Design a protein around this motif. Structure first.
Motif, PDB file in Angstrom:
ATOM      1  N   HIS A  23      -6.124  10.860 -27.714  1.00 55.29           N
ATOM      2  CA  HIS A  23      -6.135  12.308 -27.864  1.00 55.29           C
ATOM      3  C   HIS A  23      -4.934  12.935 -27.186  1.00 55.29           C
ATOM      4  N   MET A  27      -1.701  15.371 -28.850  1.00 54.16           N
ATOM      5  CA  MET A  27      -1.334  16.688 -28.352  1.00 54.16           C
ATOM      6  C   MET A  27       0.114  16.688 -27.948  1.00 54.16           C
ATOM      7  N   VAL A  30       2.642  16.813 -31.032  1.00 50.48           N
ATOM      8  CA  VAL A  30       2.770  18.133 -31.624  1.00 50.48           C
ATOM      9  C   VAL A  30       3.756  18.918 -30.797  1.00 50.48           C
ATOM     10  N   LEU A  31       3.606  18.879 -29.480  1.00 47.91           N
ATOM     11  CA  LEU A  31       4.473  19.672 -28.622  1.00 47.91           C
ATOM     12  C   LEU A  31       5.891  19.136 -28.503  1.00 47.91           C
ATOM     13  N   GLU A  34       7.768  20.363 -31.590  1.00 42.88           N
ATOM     14  CA  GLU A  34       8.052  21.771 -31.419  1.00 42.88           C
ATOM     15  C   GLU A  34       9.199  21.970 -30.458  1.00 42.88           C
ATOM     16  N   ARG A  35       9.235  21.179 -29.393  1.00 42.57           N
ATOM     17  CA  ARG A  35      10.295  21.310 -28.403  1.00 42.57           C
ATOM     18  C   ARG A  35      11.650  20.930 -28.962  1.00 42.57           C
ATOM     19  N   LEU A  38      12.900  23.887 -30.625  1.00 44.77           N
ATOM     20  CA  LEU A  38      13.064  24.986 -29.688  1.00 44.77           C
ATOM     21  C   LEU A  38      14.387  24.855 -28.972  1.00 44.77           C
ATOM     22  N   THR A  39      14.673  23.660 -28.464  1.00 46.06           N
ATOM     23  CA  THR A  39      15.901  23.445 -27.713  1.00 46.06           C
ATOM     24  C   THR A  39      17.143  23.654 -28.549  1.00 46.06           C
ATOM     25  N   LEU A  42      17.930  27.281 -28.406  1.00 45.69           N
ATOM     26  CA  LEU A  42      18.404  27.615 -27.072  1.00 45.69           C
ATOM     27  C   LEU A  42      19.846  27.168 -26.892  1.00 45.69           C
ATOM     28  N   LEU A  43      20.159  25.946 -27.315  1.00 38.96           N
ATOM     29  CA  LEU A  43      21.509  25.416 -27.167  1.00 38.96           C
ATOM     30  C   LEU A  43      22.512  26.179 -28.006  1.00 38.96           C
ATOM     31  N   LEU A  53       9.176  27.585 -35.086  1.00 38.48           N
ATOM     32  CA  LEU A  53       7.988  26.747 -35.174  1.00 38.48           C
ATOM     33  C   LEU A  53       7.443  26.691 -36.592  1.00 38.48           C
ATOM     34  N   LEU A  60      -2.674  19.815 -36.954  1.00 43.41           N
ATOM     35  CA  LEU A  60      -1.308  20.317 -37.023  1.00 43.41           C
ATOM     36  C   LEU A  60      -0.301  19.241 -37.329  1.00 43.41           C
TER      37      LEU A  60
END
Lengths: 104, 506
Positions: A23, A27, A30-31, A34-35, A38-39, A42-43, A53, A60
């Motif tokens: 489990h 989790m 998924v994150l 997404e990261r 995201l980065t 930012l970069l 996202l 998901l």
């Protein structure tokens, strides 16, 4: 022969540990995906919006269909590691999943 | 002719060794001492004028037979003093006419597994030559200092001066070598002409000693080092006369290995000159070692590499005038070798400072991410192994940096670095004070290393990438909470359903 016999049992333990952290693993993935995106933003120097996202726990993973490159090749490297390296990864995964029981 | 060629390259030294044997055959009277002078003359000219040495090679060994002849003719006891000169001349003869010319030609630069072994050995040989071509002024300079730090005098003092004013200013290196060779031989000759019978009862070096070889063995090995260095220079010259980049770092593990064997003191050099000053003030602990302390804390304080590069001119002059003055105050002294090891390291960083102006993925994560966390464990075990007042300070800095650590690993460089620099000043203060007031410095030196390594990780370009990851996780925290809470609520519902089913059945 005993060395190879022992290696078989190591793999059995690794399998159990992987099921004990299943489990948490989902989790995390998924994150992680997404990261990744995201980065990138930012970069670039831009803002991280919801659309980032949108381009992309168990549910998901299935819904998302934006298959990323680097992350997949990384998984292959991991699968193609030695049994020793993989067993130690399994141990770290277990500790980082159930941290409360360690503190106690 | 295989063995003739072996003798035409690796056997001229048999004649040289025999020269010494004659000179040191029992009570050395004038003639045996002159025998030594002749050996010395040969080896000295080799350094000074290679061309001329080659020109009078076997001519000198023919003059050798000449000397040996007269001796044995004029002078069992007496027969043993005839035997040795005879043996000497015999060896000369063989080279003299049979191998001397093919040697002048060797010096003229102007089954299955055996072949495999030969190739392996060949690789080794070539590599080792390269290394010893550049890393030999080091061993020469270090040995002439160890000798003249043991036998403190005013005739071995000049040797310290030579290899301690030619290490900072490295244009003198050729002339250093030259003058050392002549002077070491002056020392050897004088000290031998003091083992005579008319020379009987120290500041000036010359003294008497019953084992004559053992006495003049030290200064002989120096002459040896010096000459061996020149051999390596010319041998490597002959090899090539006749017959690991930045990019490699980011490829394979071996690629990175090579980059560092090539350049380690290129990059990590200011850090190693500072870890050598900590060694002086930890093995000496006197009062003249406290000025090395004050230099560390006035060079470290100008935190910019560029500013430090303007004070290096003076750091290097100071360290050289301090070794000499401390050895003038030791003549009117075997721990002053730590002030040398550091005049060496710092003269070499003055060179970088004027020349810069002209599965590996797994390792990089465990050095640029999970190392801050290991530095923090070392800070604890630096201050809980040495129970004192200073030790409590370390314990309490670990506690602060563990609590406010996540925020530090994220802040912009300016700050990231301020905190680290401050932690570095507690270390240096402790080190410089444990001295002024006197359990030691070892554990505060393991710590000074780690903290200087993390200042480099926190100023890299590979850390920029880990800062990104850490910043992102703080933003995606809310998503994390949602994921978790959703999972919790789902399981709640499934369990609740099962219980209601049971109650229906009941």
């Amino acid at each position: 022969f005993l060395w190879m016999l022992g290696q078989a049992l190591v793999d059995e333990l690794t399998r159990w540990l992987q099921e004990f952290t299943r489990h948490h693993g989902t989790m995390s993935d998924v994150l992680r995906a997404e990261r990744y995106l995201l980065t990138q933003e930012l970069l670039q120097g831009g803002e991280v919006h919801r659309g980032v996202l949108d381009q992309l726990a168990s549910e998901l993973l299935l819904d998302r269909r934006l298959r990323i490159p680097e992350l997949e090749e990384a998984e292959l490297f991991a699968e193609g590691q030695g049994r020793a390296l993989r067993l130690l990864r399994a141990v770290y995964q277990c500790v980082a999943a159930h941290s409360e029981l360690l503190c106690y | 002719e295989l063995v003739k060629g072996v003798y035409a390259k690796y056997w001229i030294y048999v004649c040289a060794g025999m020269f010494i044997v004659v000179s040191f055959a029992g009570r050395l009277v004038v003639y045996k001492i002159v025998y030594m002078f002749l050996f010395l003359l040969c080896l000295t000219l080799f350094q000074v004028y290679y061309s001329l040495w080659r020109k009078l090679l076997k001519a000198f060994w023919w003059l050798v037979v000449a000397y040996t002849m007269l001796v044995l003719i004029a002078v069992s006891e007496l027969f043993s003093s005839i035997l040795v000169p005879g043996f000497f001349l015999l060896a000369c003869i063989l080279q003299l006419h049979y191998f001397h010319r093919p040697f002048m030609q060797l010096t003229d630069m102007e089954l299955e597994l055996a072949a495999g072994f030969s190739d392996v050995l060949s690789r080794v040989q070539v590599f080792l030559r390269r290394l010893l071509e550049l890393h030999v002024f080091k061993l020469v300079a270090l040995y002439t200092v160890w000798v003249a730090l043991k036998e403190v005098s005013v005739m071995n003092l000049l040797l310290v001066v030579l290899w301690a004013f030619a290490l900072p200013y490295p244009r003198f290196r050729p002339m250093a070598s030259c003058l050392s060779t002549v002077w070491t031989c002056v020392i050897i000759v004088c000290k031998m002409l003091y083992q005579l019978k008319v020379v009987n009862p120290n500041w000036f070096g010359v003294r008497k000693g019953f084992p004559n070889l053992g006495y003049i063995q030290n200064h002989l090995q120096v002459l040896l080092l010096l000459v061996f260095e020149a051999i390596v220079y010319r041998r490597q010259e002959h090899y090539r006369r006749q017959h690991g980049t930045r990019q490699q770092l980011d490829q394979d593990l071996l690629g990175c290995l090579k980059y560092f064997i090539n350049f380690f003191f290129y990059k990590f050099g200011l850090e190693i000159c500072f870890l050598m000053a900590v060694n002086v003030i930890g093995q000496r602990m006197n009062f003249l070692v406290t000025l090395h302390g004050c230099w560390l804390v006035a060079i470290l304080t100008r935190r910019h590499r560029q500013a430090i590069a303007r004070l290096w001119p003076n750091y290097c002059l100071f360290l050289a005038l301090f070794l000499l003055y401390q050895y003038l105050l030791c003549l009117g002294s075997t721990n002053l070798i730590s002030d040398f090891l550091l005049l060496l390291c710092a003269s070499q960083q003055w060179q970088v400072f004027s020349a810069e102006r002209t599965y590996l993925d797994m390792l990089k994560v465990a050095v640029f991410r999970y190392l801050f966390w290991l530095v923090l464990v070392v800070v604890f075990v630096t201050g809980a192994t040495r129970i004192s007042i200073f030790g409590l300070g370390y314990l309490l800095a670990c506690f602060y940096l563990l609590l406010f650590g996540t925020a530090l690993l994220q802040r912009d460089t300016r700050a990231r670095l301020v905190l680290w620099d401050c932690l570095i000043l507690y270390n240096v203060t402790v080190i410089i004070s444990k001295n002024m007031l006197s359990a030691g410095i070892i554990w505060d030196s393991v710590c000074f290393f780690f903290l200087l390594l993390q200042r480099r990780v926190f100023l890299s370009h590979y850390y920029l990438h880990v800062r990104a990851d850490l910043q992102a996780t703080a933003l995606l925290a809310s998503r994390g909470f949602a994921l978790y809470n959703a999972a919790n609520l789902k399981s709640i519902d499934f369990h609740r359903r099962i219980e209601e089913k049971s109650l229906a059945q009941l």
